[PDB]
Each structure stands twice: as structure tokens, then as C-alpha cells.
Write a protein that binds this DNA or RNA. Sequence first.
RNA 1: GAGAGGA
Lengths: 146, 390, 49, 50, 335, 50, 50, 48, 67, 101, 243
Amino acid sequence: VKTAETGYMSRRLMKSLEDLSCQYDNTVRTSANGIVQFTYGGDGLDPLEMEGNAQPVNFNRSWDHAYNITFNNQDKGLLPYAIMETANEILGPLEERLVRYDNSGCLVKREDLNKAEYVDQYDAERDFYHSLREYINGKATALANL
Amino acid sequence: YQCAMGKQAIGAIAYNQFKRIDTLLYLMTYPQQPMVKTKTIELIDYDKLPAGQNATVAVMSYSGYDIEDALVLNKSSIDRGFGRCETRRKTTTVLKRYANHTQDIIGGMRVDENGDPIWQHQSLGPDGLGEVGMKVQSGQIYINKSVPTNSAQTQYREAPVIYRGPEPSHIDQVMMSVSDNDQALIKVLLRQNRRPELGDKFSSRHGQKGVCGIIVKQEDMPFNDQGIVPDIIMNPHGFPSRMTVGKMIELISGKAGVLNGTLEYGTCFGGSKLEDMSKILVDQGFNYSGKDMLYSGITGECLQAYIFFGPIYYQKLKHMVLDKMHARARGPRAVLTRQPTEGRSRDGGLRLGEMERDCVIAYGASQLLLERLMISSDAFEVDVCDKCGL
Amino acid sequence: EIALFKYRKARLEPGTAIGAIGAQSIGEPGTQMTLKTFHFAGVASMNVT
Amino acid sequence: RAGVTHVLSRLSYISALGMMTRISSQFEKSRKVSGPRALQPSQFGMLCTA
Amino acid sequence: MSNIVGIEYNRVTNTTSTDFPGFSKDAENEWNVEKFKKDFEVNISSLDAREANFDLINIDTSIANAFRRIMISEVPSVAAEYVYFFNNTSVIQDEVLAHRIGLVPLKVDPDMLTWVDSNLPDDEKFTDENTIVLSLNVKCTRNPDAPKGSTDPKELYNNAHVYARDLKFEPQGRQSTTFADCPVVPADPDILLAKLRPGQEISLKAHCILGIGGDHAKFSPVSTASYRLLPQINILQPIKGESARRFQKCFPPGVIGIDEGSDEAYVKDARKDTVSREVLRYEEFADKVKLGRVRNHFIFNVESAGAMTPEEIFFKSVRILKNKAEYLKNCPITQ
Amino acid sequence: XXXXXXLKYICAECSSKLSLSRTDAVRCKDCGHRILLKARTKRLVQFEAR
Amino acid sequence: RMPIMLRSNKCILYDADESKMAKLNECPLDPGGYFIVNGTEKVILVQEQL
Amino acid sequence: EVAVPDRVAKVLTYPEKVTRYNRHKLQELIVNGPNVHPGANYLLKRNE
Amino acid sequence: MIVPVRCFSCGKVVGDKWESYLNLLQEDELDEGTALSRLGLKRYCCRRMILTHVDLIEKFLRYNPLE
Amino acid sequence: PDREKIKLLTQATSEDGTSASFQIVEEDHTLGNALRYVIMKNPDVEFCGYSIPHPSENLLNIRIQTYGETTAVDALQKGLKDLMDLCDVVESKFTEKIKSM
Amino acid sequence: HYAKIRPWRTFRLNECVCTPYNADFDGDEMNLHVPQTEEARAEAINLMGVKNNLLTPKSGEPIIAATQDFITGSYLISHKDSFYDRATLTQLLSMMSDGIEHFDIPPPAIMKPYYLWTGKQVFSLLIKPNHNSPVVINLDAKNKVFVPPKSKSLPNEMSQNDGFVIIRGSQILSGVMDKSVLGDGKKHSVFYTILRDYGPQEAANAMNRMAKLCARFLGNRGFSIGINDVTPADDLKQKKEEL
RNA sequence: GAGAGGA
Ligand SMILES: CCC[C@@H](C)[C@H]1CC[C@H]2[C@@H]3[C@H](O)C[C@@H]4C[C@H](O)CC[C@]4(C)[C@H]3C[C@H](O)[C@]12C
Ligand SMILES: [Mg+2]
Ligand SMILES: [Zn+2]
Ligand SMILES: [Zn+2]
Ligand SMILES: [Zn+2]
């Protein structure tokens, strides 16, 4: 009694969303070139290749993999400040690449960056970079507290 | 599920099953009375015309070819005759008398050089009706029927009946008679002896339907202290999620009854108690739970777990792979839309419908979609006017 | 490096038939949604669908 | 009324016996109505409950 | 544990070989003859015309299982392969009757024939030294006596049953001399081949050839060739008293006994015991009994279908394994 | 070497052999039975005992 | 001519015991209750109604 | 991978075009014919 | 139809014993178990080959078309 | 001479032997298990194992990995010779036992 | 799929890939199409390929993985009671492969009484059978039946049962194989990690090795369900009746 | 055309 109803529902659901494509400007669009979404899901991340709960990196397992792949017995463990400096010199050159232009095309004056009225694309990337920095800061803080 | 699939279990049909010309009969060569009977089956005479055989089942994960409901049939038991079946199919022919006082002549049996019949008539006989006991193949006319071209007598268009089958079958009955209106009627029965090939469906009288996953030799099979090898090795994973404890009790009751030389009763709300069967099983020197300790047939050492071992009444179902294999490259196409036909009696393709094309769309495969739904299905070179698009 | 690689890899590649993927992802689980009787978080009287 | 008579099934003996003593519901399809397709306790001993 | 495999109530432990170097720091048990020559032993128990029960001692499971497998489906035998029907009016379909005839064992000793070459046409594929021709010709007619009606169809119909002994044997050429002393006959002449009522005839001719067991079950020489590890029972913490009788009710009768006067349970003979681990169910014999099997002490029970003596079959199995190893050794190691 | 290897109808009721000439009848002769079965071929038929 | 249900008060198989049935090529264990129309075994299924 | 019967792998033909890399293989398949499995069913000439 | 010549699981030739088995049930009426054991059928595969067998050919032969 | 029964798979085989895989046609566990038992008894054999890749094919891939002393081919040859010796010992013992009876 | 030719009449496919199709082997049937152009064939094998579709698109969780009896074989191998000598270990390693992969035998877990390996060691060899295979997996997972350790302060490795699975450097340091480790539906599986870190080919190779291993280990080991596996204990009857 | 398996 449920098979037929589920089949009909799937058929019509597919008939609705039949022609939606992620265009090369990173906008989901329909056949008539009417933009339905400006970025898929707000982040442009395909769920097929996400490795965590609503995050794409699974920080703990990736950190363990990096630890094990590059573990030599005679290596000088850096101080936590050195770890943070490495994180900020690898992450932050990428953060500079995103500038958060205003809706009028001008640049935000560094005092109203988080004014909640100037958010746009590349916000997900900034949040991801901040999460990476926070995770590395947590590891360094654990080392310092030890 | 057992009530559903017990109707489609091949076996004895009637005492006159050999004097009968039906459209499609499935018969069992060596049907066997069930070990664990029921008070109902004595009343409906199911122990006199059974459909199944008592297979020595060993419930054990073996060979890997029995993962999901798949079975492991035992070669050297199929050879001795186990699941051997027969398919009888009738072909009728009416020699109608047309209103123009013209009949249909079954004259045939052409001869090539140096006498002898031609290959297509090699199994036809002098009278145009296939010789009883011969073998026919693709081609091999066995009813050489001719029909007048002036039905609306010399001009006889030949319209023979051709055996169009994938495997040879034998002619075992040819009946010629007339109906009330005095018109000739010929019924030819073709028998085909079938072997339990890989891919045939076997049921277990408990809803444990399965396919013959693999056929392995006798020596590559577990054996007990007495050298018994199982005929069927059913996977143990069919039980824990379907809760067919009745099947385990059937195995124990059957083993105990056959060791005691009697037929045990499995009937609803009663039947042979498990305690008596276990007492009989331990009296003969077997384990109280029916779990013997086997030797691996390929390494020759003990199996580190005792194996549920005993006779289970397994019935072979009619859904055989020989009748279901079907492939097409090119052939008949529909007259209207010029697309391949649908059935199997007509060599036709497999329909790739809306769900399948949506699945292809999901992958984002455009050239494959174009090839499947246009190039390999129906392509037409049309001439469209560039001014008025007609 | 691993985090950045797995992030730049985990972007919806252009040309993806995301509409069909979404429609199937929302319809196929419906084919397995056997009717289970539920209530509104501990309120037996308040029946829900 | 259509489909009153059925060709007797000849696969096993139990198939031909079970085609006899068979009952057909008057409902055509009963698409979503889970009433006539349920196992009413009132049929205990009257109809095969399996 | 040390050439013993324990039988527990829920499992079987220590079923592996562990008789090779590298199993321990002291790399002992390295292969060498003149040490296996003396340890190995054969104790031939009751040997009959169609059965042999010989115990093999101090061989690992691999070799014994290889012998068993070769015995079942490597030792050649002679059975009907092609059946030609001249007339079959019996109710049995022709293919079924041909299968029944093919399954019938033949008391023709192999090595008196040669392998048939499949690469030849049927007109000259079968020779006199290659195949054996068996004829059957049975015609059923009524019995013009005056017995009671509706009685058994043996004194009412003449030749109403067709047995396997109805298979005749006509030699061709040299077969008139080689098979003069021992004409080929069904090893079991009472096999009910077919049944038939008056007016029915079965007339056929079968070209029985030489085949291998792995090809078809009709070519297997033995009914079943098996073995089993010798059972072993350790009665520790003696169980003397009335409880001993209970301890006796588990094992088969001729397995353990109660010592006269001492009224103490003792092992009589473990060879008669089938390991049903019954004592492992009562939990009052948790430490009073320890079951097991001797991992390298098999007791083969070979029984033939009638073609040849079982000891000849086992000898052929050993020779076939040796021939296989030798031929593999002679075969060049190509890349 | 070598090893050689190498129109009648029956009434369904009277079980008697018949020979029907062209355009005479289709019934039996001993009785009036109208059903005839073709006799088995006299030609050799080969079956593998496999 | 009214078709006769198998093993009814009008059928010849009514009260036939293992010899009449054998002479008529009829299986003793056959259920009956079905008609033979155009040489086909057609059974009128029991119809349930309100 | 999926296993296919040779009874249907001999009707499910694939049209391979001669390309001077598989000319020998394709002509060997033609020599084999439509009965032995590693063979061929139909040949379509360039102009015909 | 008739008794299988060979017992599928083991291979024993059980075709010849059938008639003998019937006698052990008709004259000197034993039980089925004792009659089966007296014929040498020790393994239960050969036992179920004979015990659970229907002699259908007896019923089939009542309809011979050459009486 | 029959250069089909035994083949040495080159892809699996390492340089200068000491680890080699062999493909044997028309064989099954019957000889594979006995050969594995005999080879594993050699003091210089580190790895020895057979496997039938697919029951539809008569094949037997047997791999022997020895140490830097005896090549795998010589290990297989000695295993075959020792299997012949074992069969001869069993045959002789059985013959003398049956003759004595 | 890539076609292979076999004598029988049935479309035979590895059971691991039967979770997408929802195949049953109870008598199910399937359709097989053959693309007739190079473009269609290439698009099929590169976009619709099995190796490239190990994850379902609705959630990204793996869906092609160990089915029934493969999880059972893995659990029986990796159960802590398992201890294999050298001959048995080499036979297992030739069973998982086809006598073609060169195996670097690690030092045994137990050395002094005898030389005994462990099922976790043999599965770690299955993951990385050489020093050339690049599959080094670092993973921490938790099975479906995880019993926490006695002390709250203790890590999950010290579980009462095997429980938490710790794999470091492709060595299964602790834990047993399970549906949450080899099966489907979890993003912390061994196959999922192998795929996500080294492409679909290595995951396919590992799954093939596991399937070939478990196709023969259950046959040569024995695993059965009987009436004593479902019968209730003597005191269980009285306790149930009282309750 | 319409009766019924089937997955
Ligand atoms: C290649 C097969 C040849 C076969 C016909 C010959 C060759 C060697 C013969 C055996 C040996 O003599 C040893 C035993 C001697 C006893 O006295 C009788 C039994 C015994 C097993 C013999 C049987 C038979 O006679 C054999 C197998
Ligand atoms: Mg299914
Ligand atoms: Zn125009
Ligand atoms: Zn007549
Ligand atoms: Zn038997």
C-alpha cells in the first residue's frame, strides 16, 4: 500500500527538479537560466564528499593521519606559539584573498566587517578557516597547559 | 510466503499426468514424501503426490556463494538425480475446412539428394507429424502444415510449425483426432528433461526461497564421521532475522524420525515434541541438538563449530533460469513507433523507462542518454524545412 | 594541507545534475518510510502525522 | 462481472487444490483502504489466517 | 594441544597442524624421511569383499584428505555413458531410464580398458579395447496361469520388472578373449531398473566407457570414502559410584564400563564412540571428563560399489597422488 | 576396433494398432473412439547417461 | 447442453472407485468442482459480497 | 565487474571500428566466427 | 517414479533394496526402522532415500495406453 | 614435455626468485593442500599458500616465498620430491601391511 | 560494470555491490545494457562506474561495503580468541589474495610459547599487504555494541569487549571488525577511509581482498545456527514466568 | 484483450 504512493511521489519530485545544474559561476540554475540558488546549500559543498557532521574535514581523523604519516622519533616538537605562527602563516594568506566588498562595491572599513549587513559568498570559507584556526589553537593550548 | 510459493513447487500432479496433454506441466522425476508430515497433508493426500525431496541440509556458511538467500547445491547428488525435473508443453494445430471446400494438408517430408530428409525435416516423419521419441532443435519442423492460398488446391502456402527453443526437447506424444464439427486437430506434446542448473529457485517450506548460488563437487564438501555430505548447504543468516524456529525443529524432528525409521508430525499447535526427538537423537549417538561435528572437505580438518546437520524437505520451484534468460541485439520492431517489441516470445529489448532515465540524468551522462534513448532505440533521418518547421 | 585539499575537493563540481540528486535523495527514503506511530514528544493525546 | 472463471492451475497438486476453495473480494483495487485487506479476528476458523 | 583437538560444549579447539619448523623458536619437525618412515603406521581392521576399515597413524590431515578426495573423484571407473534406444514403450521417459542405467555400477575391473578420445567421430571413437557394449531387451506379456486377480504383479504379468541383471554383455573382437574369465556384470544385480505392464518393451544398447569420479557421480568407485579422528576420552578425577552409571549412559554402550568390584568408570574402547559431547551437557562432569580427538590418527572406512576391492582403491589413490606429484615435477617451469 | 553403434497409430481406448489411408477416416476400428496416438518411432534414438 | 461440473450428481465420476476412474483416464485424487469447456479446465471462484 | 553468460555474450555484440591498432584482433575474431565466443557476428564494410 | 538407484548424499546403491524392504514390511512384519537397519542402511541418507519414497509408478501403470 | 601444466607468474615473482607464484592447470585442493603441507615443512620457506581463483576454471595459484638462500622454484621442486617420498612411504607400508594381514 | 564471461546462465555480481541494487538472490532478475559508442561507454565507465559510486549521494555515507556473512567472517577472524601459526596465516593471506600479492609477514604477536599471530594482524595485512602499497590508514571508530570501560577516566580502547577500533599506520591496534567498521552507513569505516585517502582503486582492492578472504574462511572455519542457539536456559523459563 | 504467479 505504500510502494505505489512512494513511486508516484518520487516521479513528481523528479519532474519538478529535473533540470537544475550547478553552473560554472557556482549558482544552481534551472533550464530557463532563472537562478534559484546563488550558492548550493549556502556553501557550495557537495554532500557526497563531506567527511563530518555538516563539516567537510573531520578534524580529528585528519589530524591523526597527519600525525602518523609524519612521525619521526628524532624531531624537535615546536612550542605552541610556533605552531600558531605556522597556522597563521599558512592560513591567512588565503583569508587575505577574500575582502568582503560592500553591496555598493566599496570595501568595508575593518570596523563593520561583522555588521551582519555585509555578508555574502565566501563567508563559509572564512568560517571554515576560523574553525581550522580554532582547532589548531585548541591543540596548542592543550600542549601549553601540559 | 510458504503458502504463496507452495503452489508453484514442481512435483507430481496426478496419476494420469502422463496421459495428459496440458499447456505447461512441470514434473519431478523422483518426488519424495516429506519427513516431517502434518495431520493436514494426510487428509489432502499430499503424501501421495508430493512436490519435493528430503535434502540433507547442513546449515553453515560455505564457499561464500550463499550470502543473500543463495544456496550451495551439491554436485554428485544432482548427477545421481536430485531436483531433476521435466517440462511438458503442448502445441495444437487445427486443420480448418474453409468455406471454399478447401482443407489444410499436413503433407511434408521433403528429401534432398541421395534420399534422406533435409535438416529442417530431419525429425518430421513420413506423415508430416513429428516422430514420437525423436529430438527437435531450433528449426526442426514437427508439424508440416500447409494452407491454401485461395482460402478467400494446388497452390499450398507452407506454414509449418517450428520448434523455436533455446535447448533441444523431445516429442513424446502426438494425438490426432477431430472435434464435433469434424475438423482435424493435432496436439503434439514436447518433453524437456531439465537438470538443476545454477540459478534455479529452491524453496524450503518455510518461506526461505533461494537460488542455486553454486554447484560444488562432493569432495569439496563437509563430511561427518560416517562420510555423509550435504545435498544443500543453506546459509545460517536466513534464521536470525526471520525467526524460522519451525525450520530448526523440522530438521531435528526429521533427523530423529529417519534415524528411528518413522515419519514425524509437524502440525499446528502440537506435533512431535522436541524432547522426544532429542532423546531419539541422543540414543543413536548423535548430539541432542542435531549439531554434528563435521570435517572440512578442502582442508580435511575439523570445523571449529558444530554444524546443524539433518534432512530438510526442500522443494524445487518452477522459476527456472532456462526460461528467464533473454537477450536482444537486433530483431523485430513495433510497426507503429519502430521500437523493439516488449515480450520474450518476441525478441525484444528491455525497457529503460522514466526512472532509469532519471537515474542516468542524476549521473549527468548526456552522451550515454542520447545513445540509449535515440541511437540504440529508434533513430530516424528526417528532413525539416528551415522556413516552416515541418 | 590535508584540510585545504579536502575542502577544495569537497565543492559541488560545475555541471552536476544537482536537481536529480536532490529529488532522488528526498524521494527514495520515502520508499522505506514504513508507518511508525508517533506522538508529539510525550503527549499521547496529541496525535501527529 | 468479469473474471468469474479462472483457468485451473496445474503446477503441483496443492496448487490445483488451493485454486479450488478460493475466495475473491468484491473490491476492485482498494488502493489505500487498509480495511478489507486486514486480518479480521472474526475469521478465526472460517478463513485461512495465513 | 600437542596432537590433540579438544571437543568443548560450544566449539572445537586446536584443529590446525602445527608440525612445521617456524612454529617455535626450536625449529623442529622439519621434513625428512626415515623419521616419517618409522612414525607412520597402518592397522588394518576388518576387511571385507566390499569394505575396508584401515587406521592410518601419524600423518597430517592434508595427506589423508588428499587420499580421500582422490579416492572419491580421481580413481577411474567404468559406467554407462551413452545409451541407444531401439524401442521404449514403458511409462518411464527415455532420459530417465538412461540415467538409471548410467548410475548402475558394473563389476568390470578397470585397466582392462583405455581412455576414450573425445576428438574422434562416433563411427570410430569407440573400439573393442575402449568401450564395453551392454544389451538390454525385455518384453512384458501377461501370465496365462490362474491365480487370484488383483494380486501382486509378479505372478500376474510375466517379466513385469526389469532389473539391472537384465543388462547383457556382448564382446567385440579381442573382448571375446580378454573378458572370457570375467564377463562384465552389474555389481548389484537386484537394482530395480524399471517396471512395465504387458504390451511394453525396453530394447537398448549402452556403450559403457571409462570415466573419472569428478566428471560424474556414476563414475565414483566407492559409495563413500571417509575418515574420522580417533576419539579420546580422559576420565580424570575418577567417577566411581552410582554416578558412574549415569556417566555410562551418555556414551554409546560399548565405549566405557564400570570396573567389577571397584565400581569405577573406565574407558573400554574409544573406537566405538561417536562424539555427541553428551557428558558436556550435565555440568556435573565439568572436571570429571575431558573429550578430544587424535588429530593425526584417522580410521578410514572405504566401501566399494562392487567394481574393485577397497584396498586396491586406496592403493590406486596413493599411486595417483604420487603420479600427480611426479608429473608436476617433470612438467617444465614455464614463465 | 570399432563398435558399430548402429506409420502406425494406436487407439486411445482399444489400444490397437491402426493404419489410416489418405482420406478414409480418423476414428478407430475395433471401437468408435475418435482419439489416436502416433506410435513411437522405429528409428534409433541416442541418450547420454550423463 | 449444460456443462457439467466435475464430480457432481450428473458427472459420471460421481461414485467411481479406482477402477471406473482408471478406465476413464481420471486421477482418483483430482479435486473436481471445475468445468471442462473448450477442453479447458475453468473453475468458478467463490465470490464474496456484502 | 559482472559475470555474463557466454550464451548472451555471443548475441550482445559491440561495434568496434578497425583502427590499425586492433585490425589483427578484429580479423582474428572474424576468423573465429559467430559460434566460438571470442568471435564476431556481423561485418559492415566502409562503403557498403 | 521408482526408487533412486543411488542415495544422493553418500552414493550407496539403494535401488536394489526397495523390493526387499517391502517384503520386510509385508511378510515378517517388522517396524520400518528395524527393516531399514537390517538392510545395511546405516547412514540416515540411505534411510530417508527408502523410507520417504512414494512408489508413484504403481499408480502411473494403471493408465497404460497399450492394455 | 608439457609447458602448460606449470607456469611461473612473472608479475608476482621478484628478482632472483626467493618469492614466486605458480599457476597450475587442471588441479584443485587435492594436490594444493598436500603441496602446501610439504613445502611449509621446509626450514627455508617463509610463506606458502595455494588458492583456486575461480571454480569455473581449472587453476591453482600456489605462492612460495623463501628467504635469501633457496629460490622458490627449488623450494617447489623439493616439495614435490618430498611429496613423492611421502607417497612412496605410505604405499610401501600399506603394501606390506596388507600382504602380512 | 566491466564484463566477464562465465559458463552459467545468471548475471553474477559480487555481493558487496548488492546493497545499491537492493538485490536479493531469491529469484531476482536484472537488466544489462551494452552501450554502442565510445562516448556512451566512456561516460558510463567514468561517471556510472562502481568504483566511483561507493558513496550514496543522499548522505555521502558508504553504501558498497561488506554485506551479511562478510561481517561475520571479519568478526570471527578478528575475535580476540583468534591465534594463527605461520602456516595458517600464510594460507589465509593466499586466500584473501589469489596467490599473487607479495606479503611482508610482520613479527608475531605472541613469541615465546609459540609463534602466533592475531586476526587483527591478518586484517592489517589485508589493508597493507606490502611495503609498496600506500594504504596507511589512521582511524578511530566505535562498533555497534560498545561497552565502556570500568573507569570513566579510561579511554575507549580499554572497553570491556573489543568495542572501540583503533587503527594506526594501517595496523589494527585494537578493536574488532564490525558493521560500523567494514559495513555501510558510517563515514568512519575502513573502506571509506581507504577510498577518501587513496582513490577508489585502493578501496576496491581492499574490498575484493576481504570478500575473497571471507568466501573461504567461513567454509574452512565453520559457523552454524542450531536449536541450542535459540533454546532458553533452564532458570530463564522460571524467571520469565515470574515476571 | 484480461487471470495469475514473480522480484
Ligand atoms: C596401477 C594399478 C594396478 C593395480 C591393478 C594393482 C597394482 C598394485 C596392486 C596392489 C599392490 O600389489 C599391493 C596390494 C597387494 C595385495 O596382495 C592386494 C591388494 C594390493 C593393494 C594390490 C591391488 C592391485 O592388484 C594393485 C593396485
Ligand atoms: Mg529478492
Ligand atoms: Zn517549408
Ligand atoms: Zn478403438
Ligand atoms: Zn547414503
